[PDB]
From a paper:
TRPV2 is a member of the TRPV subfamily and shares ∼50% sequence identity with TRPV1. While heterologously expressed and endogenous TRPV1 localizes to the plasma membrane and is activated by noxious heat and endogenous and exogenous vanilloids, heterologously expressed TRPV2 predominantly localizes to intracellular membranes. In addition, TRPV2 does not respond to heat or vanilloids in vivo812. In heterologous expression systems, TRPV2 activity was shown to be increased by exogenous small molecules such as 2-aminoethoxydiphenyl borate (2-APB) and probenecid, and blocked by ruthenium red and Gd3715.
Here we report the structure of full-length rat TRPV2 at ∼5 Å resolution determined by cryo-EM single particle reconstruction. All six N-terminal ankyrin repeats of the ankyrin repeat domain (ARD) are clearly resolved, suggesting that the ARD is a rigid, stable domain in full-length TRPV2. Like TRPV1 and TRPA1, the pore of apo-TRPV2 consists of two constrictions or gates: an upper gate resides at the selectivity filter in the outer pore region of the channel and a lower gate is comprised of the distal end of S6. In addition, the lower gate of apo-TRPV2 has a larger Cα–Cα distance compared with TRPV1 in all states, including the open lower gate in RTX/DkTx–TRPV1 (14.4 Å). These results suggest that the TRPV2 channel can accommodate partially hydrated Ca2+, Na+ and K+ ions, as well as large organic cations in the apo state.
Author numbering:
A (entry chain D): 194 to 418, 430 to 561, 591 to 715
B (entry chain A): 483 to 561, 591 to 674
C (entry chain A): 194 to 289
The structure:
């Protein structure tokens, strides 16, 4: 039953699943949902596909939202559909069916940032005793205080399309971090980051340590001509760009050159492209004759040294601060420069026009004396209307402080609007986002790739006949009655 | 303090140069006892302790930026003593950036459009620390360091009875 | 009863006191804690030392934490161990 209102188009709609059982989930009744399967004349099925090749369970998550009362009733229906499902179709695994794009519902629950089922969906208490074949996503053995255990459906990085495949790259994120702060995905941060943070430091070394000695060329550089060490520099200046060119290019080969939707913090990823791209300007002048090489390779060295700020990351906490401010002030920096710099055009014209009694861009430095500010203020009376330019410049002492103030207080508003543990968790997102490249290896060509031997403990504890899973053991301390 | 003493008769010579720091840090460390004659100290060690972590994080970020730009200054201005030429960049640290534009370098716009990049990020480099501090006070402390005043006193009681 | 899990090493543990009465504090029951002293065949004792030479009361504080509900029940056991203790061993000072 598909149409205008039943299509997922923006506004005047809701994509409930375009068939009788699909809206029966949205009806929050749980009485006809049983009967429309139990009906002996023509029984329905969760197997019923739609315009995007979905069972009802994909529509449950799309119809689910940030309304606790709705998610609570949605959860209650959702859990019992597996009890009615697995009973009537035990041969069919229910939460592994893919849409038309090739995406499972538990994975697709991460795609739209569903809040309040999604935490529930991972953390489920109903297999033992009444569906022992369903497997919880939870288990426990040996507790005085509980030694817990969580399973792995698709959420571990390497399994070909996890949530780590989309929450890192294809995240349509109203805000992510919380979805990640839940215990099985949250704890997973450190289980491999122990093994990866040393290799991150080992690769971070290789990012920054060669950028250090990349500078000493310019220290020893002559303008016009064991001294082979100076000439040797050129061979590492080749590698300065060419290493970080290919490396950041084949990232887009696996990111397929994905569209600007990931503008959020992938500008940091393309800040490496700036150094990579801009290093070549000198190389292919430099033997030939062309001449603009020393003038513009300045910026190649500049932005490279600038972009070493990026890794203010995980050796200490502070970064919880770093990207919180650095991200939000990139919006402030845009709003700052758009307001300020455009004021002083007509006043540099007013300065040169009143001081009459293409090189005015250099005469605008007279006004840029007061930007720091170190306003000259030097009053003379050769202009013959002395009070014009003198009573002009006193107008800017107040508004220049205001132009700092309003941004100082637009910032106050950003911190007055409290963030409890939002960007504190984005520290772990920035780390877990940086985990994307760790398991894959290096088409940089140290070793052309790296394999996968980073999977978690074999469950081998389920109900007959399929007894097998992949799982992980977690520790807890609880103080209830027992 | 001893560095001067056991040069000073003998002949060795580096005594007046390095006893400066003995006098300096001694006068500096008289800040320590901003303690109990008035309350204020409830403020003193609250900030002084937490900003010692901020001071470490501040210097690690800032000072290392201006190495390659002092090289960029001397390299573009061609047309071991560069540590003294780095004072040209440390003019803008306070800041009292010279800004003096000349055209003998023959690519005038390189070093001129370079230096304008640092007016924004130097304010940002203050800002992010100003607001990393805001975050430390946004994360409210009710009577925590107000009581650490009494800890600092009761910690200083350790030596009083012993003699 | 000492081992890997019963040792105080970081993670995969809790140092409860490595003997029957020591975990009987952690069980939050206060019914067997009396009987394992009142038992006429072989009575236990708070005098029972462990790998760090402790009574049960040193383990109570190590097992105690920043959980109000746990400290509340821990306090209730802790106070009554002195009432059962001082009654049955009045000669011995217990918290020294």
């Amino acid at each position: 039953a598909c149409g205008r209102f039943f299509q997922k188009h923006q506004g005047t709609c809701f994509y409930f699943g375009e068939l009788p059982l699909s809206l029966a989930a949205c009806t929050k009744q749980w009485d006809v949902v049983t009967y429309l399967l139990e009906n002996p004349h023509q029984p329905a099925s969760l197997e019923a596909t739609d315009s995007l090749g979905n069972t009802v369970l994909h529509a449950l998550v799309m119809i689910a939202d940030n309304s606790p009362e709705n998610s609570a009733l949605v959860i209650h229906m959702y859990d019992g559909l597996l009890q009615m499902g697995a009973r009537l179709c035990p041969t069919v695994q229910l939460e592994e069916i893919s849409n038309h794009q090739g995406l499972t519902p538990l994975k697709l629950a991460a795609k739209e940032g569903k809040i309040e089922i999604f935490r529930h969906i991972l953390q489920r208490e109903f297999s033992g005793p009444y569906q022992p074949l369903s497997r919880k996503f939870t288990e426990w053995c040996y507790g005085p205080v509980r030694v817990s255990l969580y399973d792995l459906s698709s959420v571990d990085s390497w399994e070909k399309n996890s949530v780590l495949e989309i929450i890192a790259f294809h995240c349509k994120s109203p805000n992510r971090h919380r979805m990640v702060v839940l215990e099985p995905l949250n704890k997973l941060l450190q289980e491999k980051w122990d093994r990866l943070v040393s290799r991150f430091f080992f690769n971070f070394a290789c990012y920054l340590v060669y950028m250090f000695i990349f500078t000493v060329v310019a220290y020893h550089q002559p303008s016009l001509d064991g001294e082979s060490m100076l000439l040797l520099g050129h061979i590492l200046i080749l590698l300065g760009g060419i290493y970080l060119l290919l490396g950041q290019l084949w990232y887009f080969w696996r990111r397929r050159l994905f569209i600007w939707i990931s503008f959020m913090d992938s500008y940091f990823e393309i800040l490496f492209l700036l150094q990579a791209l801009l290093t070549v300007l000198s190389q292919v002048l430099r033997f030939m004759e062309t001449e603009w090489y020393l003038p513009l390779l300045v910026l190649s060295l500049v932005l490279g040294w600038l972009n070493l700020l990026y890794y203010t990351r995980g050796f200490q906490h502070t970064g919880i601060y770093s990207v919180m401010i650095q991200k939000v002030i990139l919006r402030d920096l845009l709003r700052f420069l758009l307001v300020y710099l455009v004021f002083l055009f007509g006043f540099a014209v007013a300065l040169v026009s009143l001081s009459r009694e293409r090189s005015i861009l250099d005469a605008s430095l007279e006004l840029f004396k007061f930007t720091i500010g170190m306003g000259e203020l030097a009053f003379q009376e050769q202009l013959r209307f002395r009070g014009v330019v003198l009573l002009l410049l006193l107008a800017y002492v107040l508004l220049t402080y205001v132009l700092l103030l309003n941004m100082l207080i637009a910032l106050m508003s950003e911190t007055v609007n409290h963030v409890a543990d939002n960007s504190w968790s984005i520290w772990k997102l920035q780390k877990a986002i940086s985990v994307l490249e760790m398991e894959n290896g290096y088409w940089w060509c140290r070793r052309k790739k790296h394999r996968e031997g980073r999977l978690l403990k074999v469950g081998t504890r389920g109900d007959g006949t399929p007894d097998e899973r992949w799982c992980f053991r977690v520790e807890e301390v609880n103080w209830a009655a027992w």
